[PDB]
C-alpha cells in the first residue's frame, strides 16, 4: 500500500503558475482520500479540473472544490452529495495541511482548503486528509491574490489535475 499522490496545475487568469502535489493519507482516512483522488482524476465523470479557488484569506487558507456552483454553495462527493466525517485523528498542525470544508457535522462534499498556517480551532470539526508534498511555494504565491474577506483579485483555477502515484 502506498498513499496516493495527486497534483494540481494552478493558473492565474489563464496564465500557468505551477504544480502543487499532495500526499493523501489513505491509510488513516481511506474514504475521504478516495473521494479527493477520484475527483482529481475526473474518473466518475466530474471533478476539480477547470474549477476555481473561490476564497483565499492570506495567513489562513485557500478554499476550492466547488465545481458545480463555483462559489462555496456546491460540489458533491463521489458517494452522493455529502458523506460523513470519517474520523478526526489528524490535526491542523501547520502550513500545507489538506482538510475538508463543510457546513456542519457529516456534510462533506468536494470543497477542501489548504492551510497556510496552523489552525488548531478547526481540529475535531474538519477532517484532515492530506498534505502538500511539493509546490508549497505555488500555494504561497496563490495567497497573494486573496484578501481579508476571501475574494481573490485574479481568477485562480485548477487548469489540470491528476494522480501521480
Amino acid at each position: 500500500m502506498v498513499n496516493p499522490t495527486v497534483f494540481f496545475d494552478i493558473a492565474v487568469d489563464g496564465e500557468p503558475l505551477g504544480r502543487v502535489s499532495f500526499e493523501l493519507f489513505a491509510d488513516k482516512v481511506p474514504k475521504t482520500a478516495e473521494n479527493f483522488r477520484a475527483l482529481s482524476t475526473g474518473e466518475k465523470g466530474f471533478g476539480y479540473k477547470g474549477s476555481c479557488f473561490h476564497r483565499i484569506i492570506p495567513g489562513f487558507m485557500c478554499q476550492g472544490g466547488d465545481f458545480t456552483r463555483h462559489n462555496g454553495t456546491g460540489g458533491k462527493s463521489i458517494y452522493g452529495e455529502k458523506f460523513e466525517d470519517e474520523n478526526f485523528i489528524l490535526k491542523h498542525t501547520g502550513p500545507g495541511i489538506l482538510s475538508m470544508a463543510n457546513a456542519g457535522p457529516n456534510t462533506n462534499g468536494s470543497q477542501f482548503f489548504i492551510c497556510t498556517a496552523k489552525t488548531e480551532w478547526l481540529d475535531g470539526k474538519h477532517v484532515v486528509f492530506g498534505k502538500v508534498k511539493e509546490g508549497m511555494n505555488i500555494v504561497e504565491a496563490m495567497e497573494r491574490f486573496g484578501s481579508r474577506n476571501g475574494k481573490t483579485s485574479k481568477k485562480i483555477t485548477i487548469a489540470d489535475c491528476g494522480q501521480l502515484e
Binding site: 476564497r55 484569506i57 489562513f60 487558507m61 478554499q63 466547488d66 462555496g72 454553495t73 460540489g75 482538510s99 470544508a101 463543510n102 457546513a103 456534510t107 462534499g109 470543497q111 482548503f113 489552525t119 480551532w121 478547526l122 474538519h126 476571501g150
Partner: peptide, 11 residues
C-alpha cells in the same frame, strides 16, 4: 472569524 464553511460563511 476564521471558518471554512460551504454556504453560510460566518465571521
Amino acid at each position: 472569524x476564521l471558518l471554512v464553511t460551504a454556504g453560510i460563511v460566518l465571521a
